[PDB]
Amino acid sequence: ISGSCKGRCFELQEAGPPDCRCDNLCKSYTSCCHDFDELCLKTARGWECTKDRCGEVRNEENACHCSEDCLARGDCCTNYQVVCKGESHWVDDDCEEIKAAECPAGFVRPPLIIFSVDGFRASYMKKGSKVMPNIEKLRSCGTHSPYMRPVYPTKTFPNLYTLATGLYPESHGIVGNSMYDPVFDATFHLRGREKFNHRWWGGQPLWITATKQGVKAGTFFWSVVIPHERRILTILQWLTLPDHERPSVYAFYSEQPDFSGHKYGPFGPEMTNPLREIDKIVGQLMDGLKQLKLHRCVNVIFVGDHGMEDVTCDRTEFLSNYLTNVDDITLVPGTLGRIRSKFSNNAKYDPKAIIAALTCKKPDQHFKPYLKQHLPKRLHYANNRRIEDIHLLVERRWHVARKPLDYKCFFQGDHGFDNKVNSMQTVFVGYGSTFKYKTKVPPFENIELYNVMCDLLGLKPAPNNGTHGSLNHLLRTNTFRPTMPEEVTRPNYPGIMYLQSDFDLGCTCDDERHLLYGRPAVLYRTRYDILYHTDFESGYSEIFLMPLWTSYTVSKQAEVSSVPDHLTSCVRPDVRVSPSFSQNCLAYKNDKQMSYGFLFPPYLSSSPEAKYDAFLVTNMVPMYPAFKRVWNYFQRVLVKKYASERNGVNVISGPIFDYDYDGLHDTEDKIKQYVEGSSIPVPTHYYSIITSCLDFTQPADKCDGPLSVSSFILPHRPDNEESCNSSEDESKWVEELMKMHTARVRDIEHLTSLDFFRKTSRSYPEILTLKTYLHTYE
Numbered sequence: 001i002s003g004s005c006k007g008r009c010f011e012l013q014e015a016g017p018p019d020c021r022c023d024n025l026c027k028s029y030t031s032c033c034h035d036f037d038e039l040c041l042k043t044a045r046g047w048e049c050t051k052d053r054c055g056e057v058r059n060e061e062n063a064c065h066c067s068e069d070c071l072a073r074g075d076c077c078t079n080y081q082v083v084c085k086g087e088s089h090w091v092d093d094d095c096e097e098i099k100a101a102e103c104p105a106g107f108v109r110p111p112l113i114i115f116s117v118d119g120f121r122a123s124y125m126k127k128g129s130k131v132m133p134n135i136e137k138l139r140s141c142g143t144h145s146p147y148m149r150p151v152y153p154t155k156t157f158p159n160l161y162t163l164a165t166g167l168y169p170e171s172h173g174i175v176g177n178s179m180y181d182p183v184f185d186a187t188f189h190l191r192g193r194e195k196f197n198h199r200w201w202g203g204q205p206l207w208i209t210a211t212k213q214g215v216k217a218g219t220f221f222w223s224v225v226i227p228h229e230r231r232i233l234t235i236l237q238w239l240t241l242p243d244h245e246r247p248s249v250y251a252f253y254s255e256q257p258d259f260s261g262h263k264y265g266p267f268g269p270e271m272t273n274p275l276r277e278i279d280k281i282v283g284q285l286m287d288g289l290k291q292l293k294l295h296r297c298v299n300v301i302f303v304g305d306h307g308m309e310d311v312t313c314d315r316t317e318f319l320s321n322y323l324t325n326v327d328d329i330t331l332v333p334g335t336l337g338r339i340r341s342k343f344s345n346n347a348k349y350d351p352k353a354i355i356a357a358l359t360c361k362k363p364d365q366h367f368k369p370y371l372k373q374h375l376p377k378r379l380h381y382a383n384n385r386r387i388e389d390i391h392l393l394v395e396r397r398w399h400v401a402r403k404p405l406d407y408k409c410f411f412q413g414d415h416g417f418d419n420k421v422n423s424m425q426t427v428f429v430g431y432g433s434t435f436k437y438k439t440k441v442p443p444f445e446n447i448e449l450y451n452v453m454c455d456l457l458g459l460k461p462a463p464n465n466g467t468h469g470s471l472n473h474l475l476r477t478n479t480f481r482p483t484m485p486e487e488v489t490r491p492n493y494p495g496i497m498y499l500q501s502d503f504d505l506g507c508t509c510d511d512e513r514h515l516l517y518g519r520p521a522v523l524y525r526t527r528y529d530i531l532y533h534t535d536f537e538s539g540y541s542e543i544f545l546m547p548l549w550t551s552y553t554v555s556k557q558a559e560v561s562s563v564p565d566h567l568t569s570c571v572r573p574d575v576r577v578s579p580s581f582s583q584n585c586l587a588y589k590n591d592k593q594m595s596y597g598f599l600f601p602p603y604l605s606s607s608p609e610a611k612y613d614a615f616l617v618t619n620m621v622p623m624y625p626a627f628k629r630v631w632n633y634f635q636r637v638l639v640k641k642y643a644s645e646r647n648g649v650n651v652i653s654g655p656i657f658d659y660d661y662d663g664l665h666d667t668e669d670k671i672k673q674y675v676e677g678s679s680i681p682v683p684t685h686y687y688s689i690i691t692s693c694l695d696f697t698q699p700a701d702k703c704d705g706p707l708s709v710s711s712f713i714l715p716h717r718p719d720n721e722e723s724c725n726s727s728e729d730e731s732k733w734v735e736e737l738m739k740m741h742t743a744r745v746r747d748i749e750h751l752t753s754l755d756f757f758r759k760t761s762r763s764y765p766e767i768l769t770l771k772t773y774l775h776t777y778e
């Protein structure tokens with residue numbers, strides 16, 4: 001019978017054009033039939049059976065049933081067997097390893113149930129089985145990490161879609177809870193019907209990837225009035241559908257503990273209550289799965305999207321204290337700041353004046369302004385038209401707003417800060433057939449889970465920003481095996497081919513062991529030369545006229561010499577490299593804005609004789625004088641420091657060209673600044689990979705087991721306006737700037753189209769785990 005919801009409640013073939021709908025999203029579209037809340041959302045007698053309800057006569061108006069025939073109809077309360085058939089709650093069963101998916105007949109695959117909780121800070125898991133018995137046993141039985149790193153901004157909507165796509169917000173388009181698309185000339189918001197339009201959403205989410213490859217998904221979404229218990233009973237009821245109508249992947253999301261976390265903060269005593277109610281819902285799901293004889297078949301992912309931080313209104317910075325006029329600008333306020341012009345036609349609006357008026361203007365300033373290209377590359381922002389040119393990175397525990405008027409304490413917790421902040425770290429737990437038994441894994445970013453979930457359903461994942469294989473150690477059996485990217489350009493090994501008289505670069509001068517993990521593979525068409533020296537090895541690009549990488553090893557005992565005062569302006573030609581593909585000092589001395597540095601520092605030479613190799617023209621790179629304060633401190637103080645703390649370090653350094661701020665290696669046509677009157681391109685960033693042995697008892701060049709690595713992508717900027725303390729000695733701000741721009745080896749690989757750690761004696765999945773490690777310093 002058409003026109004009403006009986007026989008169709010939460011049907012997985014929902015559609016507005018035909019009839020009124022009865023699915024779990026009819027509320028959000030305001031299109032439910034008149035009998036939806038009467039038939040599909042029954043709430044009589046609650047969600048728990050009792051001793052007296054055992055074997056009752058079927059009353060169809062009850063919320064859930066405790067009759068005898070409910071197991072066949074597939075709509076018992078989740079505690080039916082526990083209270084009526086003497087069974088035990090799943091949380092009380094001992095932890096028994098699942099060596100193989102024990103599934104009842106009919107299941108092509110272990111079902112995947114995604115359980116998402118908003119605002120579940122990683123600190124919450126320290127409450128134990130006293131508050132959350134079901135969650136802690138999922139964590140101890142299955143696979144878990146100390147925390148999971150979200151994406152920036154650490155907000156629900158960008159993170160929930162990132163979890164479903166594996167892409168950064170810059171690529172899937174959901175760059176914030178609120179955003180303005182200038183092409184649409186429209187505003188995206190949390191509340192409202194604008195979010196329902198498909199134009200805002202890029203990438204390919206998990207449910208679309210499953211649908212396209214013949215794996216039914218159903219409906220991932222739940223209208224907010226549908227209670228959590230009804231959402232669980234709906235999922236369990238779907239699990240009893242016939243074979244070719246039963247979805248394989250399911251998703252539950254909960255708005256707690258985000259709501260209570262905002263009202264009371266992450267450490268409020270009121271936080272205990274919602275975390276009990278969340279574990280109750282987890283208990284209902286696992287009780288129902290055991291009741292369905294699926295507790296040893298289903299895969300369950302308990303995941304969060306963002307943490308929570310203590311934020312009060314008394315800690316809100318106001319732009320009206322900084323800018324002469326705030327009426328000409330529109331600001332996205334809160335734990336992050338995005339500033340654009342309020343008027344289409346306003347030529348009196350200039351970003352350089354606003355950025356300057358916001359740059360180190362007050363002591364104890366709790367925000368920092370950035371052009372989006374100058375944000376730390378680990379954030380992977382910028383590359384989207386919905387991302388404004390002016391971004392304010394807000395200090396943790398603080399807010400920023402335009403005026404005090406747009407501000408009228410209502411809240412005690414908030415989120416959205418840098419994704420490396422401790423309070424923003426969230427949780428991940430994997431329990432089920434394919435997940436490992438009682439295993440802890442290192443922290444990882446949520447961009448990597450999309451590959452795992454498709455692997456759990458046999459789906460080929462759409463292109464994403466996870467490094468497929470870096471999470472292979474999460475599963476019991478992996479169908480996917482990573483492929484080392486094959487080398488595109490083979491290197492040249494040039495000997496001495498020229499005489500020093502062949503060179504007229506206008507340059508003066510008054511006169512294995514260093515490649516520990518194999519050479520980097522060049523993954524694009526170019527021409528470069530391998531150059532061996534006593535102290536360092538480098539792959540010199542003949543196209544960019546500078547090395548793409550330079551590798552050298554500093555022992556724990558290595559001494560730091562100094563350039564003699566008569567050799568400080570010494571640059572020598574490389575007789576192995578043609579003068580046609582060499583840099584020249586006349587370019588640098590005629591460029592009044594640019595100086596030069598060295599990828600291998602002459603301060604770390606093993607001998608004055610070998611020091612002349614450091615002054616080769618093939619070891620030099622264009623560097624602004626203000627950046628040379630940062631580069632020279634890193635090479636002369638910090639590398640020796642790192643080699644002392646870590647029993648030697650292997651340093652791989654090189655330039656990065658990303659003028660279009662898309663995170664990918666630029667080709668020749670995208671470089672927008674050269675050395676004046678030259679063909680020497682100006683790098684936008686400089687990277688370094690500092691590798692040691694995880695077992696510090698062994699030196700870096702004699703390491704047997706896993707490695708310890710840390711990387712940075714220092715922005716090559718002509719001023720130090722980013723560091724407000726740059727007036728003082730380099731021991732008071734440089735290390736802080738580098739900690740801000742920490743990076744994964746993976747991010748350097750994207751920005752240079754290179755591949756590191758190819759001959760390591762470790763398994764490639766373990767290496768893929770290393771290349772995704774982010775040293776957060778927190």
Ligand SMILES: *[C@@H]1O[C@H](CO)[C@@H](O[C@@H]2O[C@H](CO)[C@@H](O[C@@H]3O[C@H](CO)[C@@H](O)[C@H](O)[C@@H]3O)[C@H](O)[C@H]2NC(C)=O)[C@H](O)[C@H]1NC(C)=O
Nearest residue numbers: 167168171172202203380462463464465466662663664750
């Ligand atoms: C994160 O992953 C996404 C998706 O893999 C990456 O974005 C993709 O970037 C590539 C390279 O720029 C784009 O490919 C190109 O497509 C154009 C047509 O638009 C055409 O010239 C070629 O087919 C070329 O391959 C691709 O369209 C784009 N896709 C999406 C969905 O964004 C992104 O670069 C990754 N981020 C990082 C930091 O690696």
Ligand SMILES: CC(C)CCC[C@@H](C)[C@H]1CC[C@H]2[C@@H]3[C@H](O)C=C4C[C@@H](O)CC[C@]4(C)[C@H]3CC[C@]12C
Nearest residue numbers: 028195196198201203204205208221222223224
């Ligand atoms: C409970 C409501 C208030 C929350 C609104 C839910 C909203 C986030 C969901 C509901 C419908 C979803 C879209 C739909 O599933 C189809 C796809 C196709 C895919 O290629 C891109 C994403 C998209 C458009 C979904 C986006 C998220 C939606 C709007």
Ligand SMILES: CCCCCCCC/C=C/CCCCCCCC(=O)OC[C@@H](O)COP(=O)(O)O
Nearest residue numbers: 114116118155156160161163164190206251255
């Ligand atoms: C497949 C992995 C994802 C698991 C399934 C989640 C659904 C897929 C994600 C879709 C992107 C849009 C989110 C869906 C609705 C979000 C429901 C929700 O809970 O929103 C609450 C959020 O406003 C409040 O948090 P904040 O304002 O950021 O503090």
Ligand SMILES: [Ca+2]
Nearest residue numbers: 658664665666
């Ligand atoms: Ca680029």
Ligand SMILES: [Ca+2]
Nearest residue numbers: 720723724726
């Ligand atoms: Ca300064």
Ligand SMILES: [Zn+2]
Nearest residue numbers: 118119156258
């Ligand atoms: Zn949330």
